[PDB]
Amino acid sequence: PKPIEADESFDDFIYNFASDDALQRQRVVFPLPYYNGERASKIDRKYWKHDDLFAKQSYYTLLFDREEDMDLVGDTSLTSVQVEWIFVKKRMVKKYYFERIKGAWMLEAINLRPIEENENEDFVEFFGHFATDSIFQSRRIRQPLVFVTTDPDDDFSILETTLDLNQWFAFKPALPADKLSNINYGQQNDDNASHKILALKGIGNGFSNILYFQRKDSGWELYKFEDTSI
Amino acid sequence: PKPIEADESFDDFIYNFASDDALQRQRVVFPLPYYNGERASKIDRKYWKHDDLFAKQSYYTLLFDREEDMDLVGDTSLTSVQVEWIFVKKRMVKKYYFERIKGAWMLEAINLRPIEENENEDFVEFFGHFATDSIFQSRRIRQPLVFVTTDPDDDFSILETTLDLNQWFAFKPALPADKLSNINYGQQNDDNASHKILALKGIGNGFSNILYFQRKDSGWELYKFEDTSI
Secondary structure, eight states: OOOOGGGGSHHHHHHHHHHOHHHHHHSBOSSEEEEETTEEEEEOGGGOOOOOTTTTSSEEEEEESSGGGGGGGGOTTOSEEEEEEEETTTTEEEEEEEEEETTEEEEEEEEEEEOOOOSSOOHHHHHHHHHHOHHHHHHTEEEEEEEEEEETTEEEEEEEEEEOHHHHHHHOOOOOSSEEEEEESSOOOOTTOSEEEEEEEESSSOOEEEEEEEEETTEEEEEEEEEOOO | OOOOGGGGSHHHHHHHHHHOHHHHHHHBOSSEEEEETTEEEEEOGGGOOOOOTTTTSSEEEEEESSGGGGGGGGOTTOSEEEEEEEETTTTEEEEEEEEEETTEEEEEEEEEEEOOTTSOHHHHHHHHHHHHOHHHHHHTEEEEEEEEEEETTEEEEEEEEEEOHHHHHHHOOOOOSSEEEEEESSOOOOTTOSEEEEEEEESSSOOEEEEEEEEETTEEEEEEEEEOOO
16 A cells, blocks of 8 residues: 555545545455354455545544643554544444555444443433433533633634523524534543543634533533634 | 713714714713623723724614614603614624613714514524615515605605615615614514514715515515605
């Protein structure tokens, strides 16, 4: 595999891997190890179907447990990154394993695993209900909701304010009901973590929203909302 | 604060407050309560920057739900009036709270925050698109458009005609793209209102245009254009 200009970073490569059919066929290891849990399978070159991943969407999602782990998105030293589909209602995670082989990003394996669960409310299952039921959503928002945005008088200036429930309904971004994406840049993904940070990032535009959730005894709740759009 | 001749009405005071720096410095309560929604702060004398408000503009705007509420502009019994900036594309508001303390108008507080309930939010989002996209604007004008002026020979009559889209483009006033003003004289500004009346008033001249919008199932549309200039 000859390294291209897209390989300089995972984020550049992944958009081209998903949007360019000819490039995708060169960057998939064949026979491709496919794991259906503990059941090992292999997908041969002839039966590969073009995977668009999240490239045709208006936005994609990223998940973190801690704010400082968002620093990892810009790490260009990464030689292994995974792309994930989290099937919210199916309790399944589909994961694509990418590796930079001699500066050239390759798909090495795909696996399917169940979402990990514990004694506390599961973030994934809570999120599915939060994203689709407005009444449940209204009961799972801290009041007032912390809102961080741009000062309308100066864009180089931060504005910290609050939103009431009616203002949240007017400002809230579109929320995925069926699937979440995630890119593993090495950020902690612990199912016992009491915080969950969902970044919503625009594809081919400056859209950027960050939703901070905290797990209370009563369950998960949205407590901080950032609009870092450019 | 010693009451002056301009304090007879809010409209006379506000032009003076914005155009005379020395007058402004004595009419602002210090430390000035400054809010960012439910977040509370203060602004001391040393960090106060002269605020021109809308005094340097050729015109300013007012918003109503019902025509008869425009009678409230001339209400001299008012002892508390608010001025606000509506940042159209950012859905942000800068509200200035004025109070007549012993016949002397004073700035009591400022709130820089996201737009709230009963602040014409739905109409304001539509208005930003109407004011900046000529194609969208042309699709959101009732055809034919009612065009009314006051009759200079008789106050009980009006001169009434209709305009086509080419005639509207030739007669239409300048429309603000980024920011609207509003002055709260006590007029209803309900979110469920199916009419929104935008008054464009001249600063230091008799210019007065009134744009009547109605919310159809298909959205807001301009249906009546009034020239009440004097």
